[PDB]
Design a protein around this nucleic acid. Structure first.
Lengths: 112, 56, 786, 133, 112
RNA sequence: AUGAUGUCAUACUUAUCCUGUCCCUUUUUUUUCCA
């Protein structure tokens, strides 16, 4: 659980590598990430409580990234749930790869 | 587990908001979630099966 | 003298113990009332046949287990060599193939179990250290593209034997000991003092008359090593004739001529045989060790040597403590063995030193880079300093890259993982240098050959207990003269070596004490006071000491044992006193186990007792996995106090089936866990003795906390608004950061340790009720003080 | 459909389970043949003394194991098993040899867990990864 | 093969069998030996994940296709700087286009 | 017409702080009807 959590939190930090002008909301996310990097068991207790009991979530933001020949939608989720989702993501991909869910033709794979 | 399945599918059903327009996702998939890779590749697995057949 | 009234009281105790056990047996056979139609029998006879069948199946594959083991056990040492005939050969192929057949006939069942639970089972809605081989085929999976000679042994043994520094000194000293009962045998390391001397005495016929030859050591495993090598010479099985007995490990049988043991083992042989009638020789090794048991046995065996002239007392040591040795032992002759293998070039720093850690660093830097082949041993004080040292060395390693060659930095102390202790024992890889940063534990009982350099910071972590407030402080202290002397002597064992002292010849010859404070002075003595009160020494003042303790420390000791009740209002033993006295642990724990009978928390207090036995090394705290360790530790944290945390961890480990990889996953030292387990079952082996009945607290941690209260009531502190302060002394203590409540900070706390590190501290603490203190000790704790 | 699929999965499972069960019963009966013929081939000059030594050692073995089981409930488990695992013990007993590992100049020349690709930012100077001079 | 035989020979693979092949191969050989082999053995499905990061962050990653911790480092442009200097003229031909001599700094090896 | 004295609270200034206090050397101890 702590290895999966460290991977999730490193991935989430990777956004604000620049440590830019960011905003209030990214400031708040960095706060959550750091306090979960310090105290990793209140974090994981929260995470599993969420995964067990929660089924009505907050609202998502959308905006578009203009690539001049098409646009790309970009979704904006709130921090508490971003952490729960990042950990769920890591856990699912790890287990799926250990039990061999995806046969060898599903190919953005980690091998090449 | 049914708990995680319910989390994952109850999480795609949220309210999407731009400046002052709001609606509810009820049909498709929000790709800006963090497990959306898993959903896309598993569903695509089901469709690989429909295209190839179980034997092949 | 006092020896004889002591022995009087001891034999009286032995007969009283026997009669006490006899009374207990008859009492309980009284308490358990042995109260021991056609279709009745026709009904139950089938059922007793059912259990007959079943327990017979268990017992049947149990006897198949017996002979299953026995086939391969006997064929191990008979078949592979000897010219044997049709019959037993046929039986070899039979037992071989037939045990394999049974193994596969159960493997079939196991295989079907696992392949029949392997399958897909639709989910149901209902409200070993190789992760660098799990990351070495990930790369090789990503990077694939396909489309007699035993006589020669003995002659060699004797040939090396002939080159001992005691082998030419054989007959002169044997006649020497034939003359005088008391013989001082002064000799340095490697001389053969521990190995050849008992061989000689075997050769002399001191073993006839059914006699034994005792050789005691200050350390169990050192006893094992010495025993192994002497049996190797003896060409026999270690354990039948040349044997050793230490805690949990008997390797002796009634053929035992040469019995090796620890000083406490010989003390406890004085619990069984006061006159030592079956031993003709007691050979006490390296008595300079300054052990509680060493200075107890010294007095006891001195009285024996006075009262038993044909008894043989041989006490050999390494250093010049022979003056006082003979002086106490009424001027024994001193037989000098010259033993010193190779010359040692000892260097001094040109001036004194300011930051000796960096001086250590840069010293080994230069020694490595400029010296020719040869290992390095370097002393530091301990663990924190030692990993900081390896940090610095490996930093330099990284920065200077291939302009150097391979610097295997190897730290070593006692509590680090045992595999990594074994790490240093590998023979050095060609081309590479092996540098061991060590604590003074590598001063004694660790002989790592190849060491040709050794550097001494002239320091050490000496304990210092002032009783005037009960302060036991592991403090920095410039090392003894003898200490540095043998820290030099640790080298040279295979070639001419060097020993660089971090201090001058001036500071050495001028500012150096000879021998570290004989522990009887410095230590806290609760168990040995209780022990000599167990043998019946009423007047413990005029007792035959070699170094008496200050009157103050024994004063506070006696007041302590009185307070916990082991002494009456004049200071002799209560029944509790003696029964707690047999337990080989301090009376704090023993009285808490006494309380567990009253509160009905037997097993829990047993387990906590076993936990504090080895505690200091439970949890590993690596620097390269800090957060995973902190978290695997925070996992167990239960409310009530860390003692029950230890309870819970042992509960979970035994839950696993005593698994090692359990403790590996959960960041716990297997060594401590395993030893705590065996010490718990040893306390259960004494459990019927002390009249303890096996009951569990039934999840009532209130009982267990109250038993801890009754045990450690002295060990309590209370809140003050200027910090946590003692209950009795009102001198200031502080909360150990590693404590399960370190930030909860209870108003009323119980502790177990008392150190004063960089701040005054207490370890493994628990939150207490002050009401339980009056519930337990209203005569020592009164209400007005709480 | 989920109920129907659950039932079909369960029954197919126990079908093949039982079939393999009968396969193992066949395997073990041919092992019964093997065992009988093992003892049959069994039944029909150091041997004599090494044989008296068999009964020697095994018989005092049963004596010692009996009386161990007797004095302490299981001191056969207090003596034999616990003897053969601890570290300095084994070093003392001369026991020999109680995976690939290599040079350590190699390791830790490199440190980190994140890709140096800034997570999509480009405006920082990461072209060369060793100073010019 | 050198690994297997170094188990057979039970010798230690030394730096000499692995400095000819230090930056070659596709992961890369210098990945076997990095610091965090132990928490990166649990990161699975990282390739799909960096692909899907385009719906979460408002910027465009030109190395969407790789990861330096997992794939090694697949290029080295350190001779480019040297040969660029030799083609522009050398540090002398380069600094006669500058205000270097009007600084009177004695020589350009100290510039900072 | 502005003296200092101040146990006066407020207003203000350094876009001055919010991470920057923490950790133990060595080591030994007798055991009892099995079933």
């Amino acid at each position: 659980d702590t290895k999966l959590l460290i991977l999730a939190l490193e991935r989430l930090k990777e956004a604000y590598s620049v440590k830019s002008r960011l905003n209030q909301s990214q400031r708040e996310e960095l706060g959550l990430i750091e306090q979960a990097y310090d105290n990793p068991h209140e974090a994981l207790s929260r995470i599993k409580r969420h995964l067990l009991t929660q089924r009505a979530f907050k609202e998502v933001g959308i905006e578009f990234m203009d690539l001049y020949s098409h646009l790309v939608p970009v979704y904006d989720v709130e921090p508490l749930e971003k952490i729960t989702d990042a950990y769920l993501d890591q856990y699912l991909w790890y287990e799926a790869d250990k039990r061999r869910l995806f046969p060898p033709w599903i190919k953005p794979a980690d091998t090449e | 587990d049914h708990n995680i399945a319910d989390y994952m599918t109850a999480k795609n059903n949220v309210v999407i908001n731009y400046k002052d327009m709001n609606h509810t996702n009820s049909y498709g998939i929000i790709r800006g979630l963090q497990f959306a890779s898993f959903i896309v590749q598993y569903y695509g697995l089901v469709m690989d099966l429909l295209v190839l057949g179980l034997h092949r | 003298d006092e020896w004889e009234r002591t022995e009087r009281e001891r034999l009286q105790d032995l007969e009283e113990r026997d009669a006490f056990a006899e009374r207990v047996r008859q009492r309980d056979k009284d308490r358990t009332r042995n109260v021991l139609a056609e279709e009745d029998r026709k009904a139950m006879v089938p059922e007793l046949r059912k259990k007959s069948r079943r327990e017979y199946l268990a017992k049947r594959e149990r006897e198949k287990l017996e002979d299953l083991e026995a086939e391969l056990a006997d064929e191990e040492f008979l078949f592979g060599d000897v010219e044997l005939s049709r019959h037993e050969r046929q039986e070899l192929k039979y037992k071989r193939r037939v045990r394999d057949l049974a193994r596969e006939y159960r493997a079939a069942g196991e295989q079907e179990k696992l392949e029949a639970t392997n399958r897909y089972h639709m989910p149901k809605e209902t409200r070993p250290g190789e992760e660098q081989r799990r990351w070495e085929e990930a790369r090789l999976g990503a990077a694939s593209l396909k489309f007699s000679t035993q006589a020669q042994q003995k002659e060699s043994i004797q040939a090396v034997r002939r080159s001992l520094p005691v082998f030419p000194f054989r007959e002169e000293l044997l006649a020497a000991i034939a003359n005088h009962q008391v013989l001082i045998i002064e000799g340095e390391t490697g001389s053969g003092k521990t190995t050849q001397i008992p061989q000689y005495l075997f050769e002399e016929g001191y073993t006839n008359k059914g006699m034994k030859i005792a050789c005691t050591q200050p350390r169990r495993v050192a006893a094992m090593s010495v025993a192994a090598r002497v049996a190797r010479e003896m060409g026999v099985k270690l354990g039948n004739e040349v044997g050793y007995s230490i805690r949990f490990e008997d390797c002796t049988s009634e053929r035992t001529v040469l019995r090796y043991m620890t000083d406490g083992m010989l003390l406890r042989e004085f619990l069984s045989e006061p006159d030592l009638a079956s031993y003709s020789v007691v050979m006490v090794d390296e008595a300079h060790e300054r052990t509680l048991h060493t200075d107890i046995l010294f007095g006891l065996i001195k009285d024996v040597a006075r009262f038993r002239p044909e008894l043989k007392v041989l006490v050999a040591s390494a250093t010049m403590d022979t003056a006082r040795f003979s002086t106490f032992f009424d001027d024994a002759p001193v037989f000098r063995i010259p033993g010193r293998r190779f010359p040692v070039d000892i260097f001094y720093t040109k001036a004194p030193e300011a930051d000796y850690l960096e001086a250590c660093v840069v010293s080994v830097l230069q020694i490595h880079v400029t010296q020719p082949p040869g290992d390095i041993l370097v002393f530091l004080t301990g663990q924190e300093e030692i990993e900081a040292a390896c940090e610095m060395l490996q930093d330099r390693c990284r920065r200077l890259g291939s302009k150097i060659r391979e610097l295997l930095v190897l730290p070593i102390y006692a509590n680090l993982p045992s595999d990594m202790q074994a790490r240093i024992f590998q023979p050095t890889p060609p081309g590479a240098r092996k540098v061991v940063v060590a604590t003074n534990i590598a001063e004694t009982s660790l002989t790592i050959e190849g060491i040709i350099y050794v550097l001494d910071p002239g320091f050490c972590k000496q304990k210092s207990y002032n009783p005037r407030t009960g302060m036991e402080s592991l403090t920095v202290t410039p090392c003894s003269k003898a200490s540095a002397n043998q820290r030099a002597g640790r080298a040279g064992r295979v070639a001419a070596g060097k020993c660089f002292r971090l201090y001058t010849a001036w500071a050495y010859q001028h500012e150096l004490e000879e021998t570290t404070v004989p522990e009887i002075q410095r230590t806290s003595l609760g168990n040995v006071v209780l022990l000599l009160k167990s043998l019946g020494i009423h007047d413990l003042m005029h007792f035959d000491f070699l170094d008496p303790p200050p009157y103050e420390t024994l004063l506070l000791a006696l007041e302590q044992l009185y307070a916990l009740g082991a002494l009456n209002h004049l200071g002799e033993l209560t029944t509790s006193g003696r029964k707690m006295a047999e337990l080989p642990v301090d009376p704090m724990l023993s009285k808490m186990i006494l309380a567990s009978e009253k509160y009905s928390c037997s097993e829990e207090i047993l387990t906590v007792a076993a936990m504090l036995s080895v505690n200091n090394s439970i949890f590993y705290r690596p620097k390269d996995k800090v957060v995973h360790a902190d978290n695997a530790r925070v996992n167990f944290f239960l409310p009530g106090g860390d003692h029950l945390v230890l309870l819970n961890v042992y509960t979970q480990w035994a839950e696993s089936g005593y698994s090692s990889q359990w403790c590996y996953e959960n960041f716990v030292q297997f060594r401590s866990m395993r030893r705590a387990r065996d010490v718990r079952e040893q306390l259960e082996g004494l459990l019927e003795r002390v009249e303890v009945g096996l009951s569990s607290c039934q999840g009532d941690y209130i009982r267990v906390r109250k038993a801890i209260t009754a045990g450690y009531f002295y060990h309590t502190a209370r809140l003050t608004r200027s910090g946590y302060r003692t209950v009795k002394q009102q001198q200031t203590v502080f909360i150990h950061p590693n404590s399960s409540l370190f930030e909860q900070q209870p108003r009323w706390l119980l502790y177990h340790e008392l150190v004063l590190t960089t701040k005054e501290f207490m370890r493994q603490v628990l939150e207490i009720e002050s009401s339980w203190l009056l519930e337990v000790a209203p005569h020592y704790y009164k209400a007005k003080e709480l | 459909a989920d109920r129907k699929a659950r039932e079909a999965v369960e029954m197919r499972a126990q079908v093949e389970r039982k079939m393999a069960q009968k396969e193992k019963e066949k395997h073990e009966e041919k092992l019964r043949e093997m065992a009988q013929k093992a003892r049959e081939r069994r039944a029909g000059d150091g041997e004599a003394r090494e044989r008296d030594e068999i009964r020697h050692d095994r018989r005092k073995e049963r004596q010692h194991d009996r009386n161990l089981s007797r004095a302490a409930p299981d001191k056969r488990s207090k003596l034999q098993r616990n003897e053969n695992r601890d570290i300095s013990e084994v070093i003392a007993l001369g026991v020999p040899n109680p995976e690939v590992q290599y040079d350590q100049r190699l390791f830790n020349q490199s440190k980190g867990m994140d890709s140096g690709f800034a997570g999509g930012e480009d405006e920082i100077y990461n072209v060369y990864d060793q100073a010019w001079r | 093969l050198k690994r297997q035989e170094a188990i057979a020979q039970n010798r230690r693979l030394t730096l000499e069998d692995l400095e000819d092949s230090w930056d070659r191969g596709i992961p890369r050989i210098n990945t076997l030996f990095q610091k965090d082999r132990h928490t990166l053995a649990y990161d699975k499905g990282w390739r799909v994940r960096t692909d899907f990061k385009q719906y979460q962050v408002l910027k465009q990653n030109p190395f969407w296709w790789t990861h330096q911790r997992h794939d090694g480092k697949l290029w080295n442009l350190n001779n480019y700087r040297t040969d660029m200097i030799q083609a522009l003229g050398g540090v002398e031909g380069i600094l006669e286009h500058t205000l270097f001599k009007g600084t009177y700094f004695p020589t350009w090896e100290g510039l900072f």
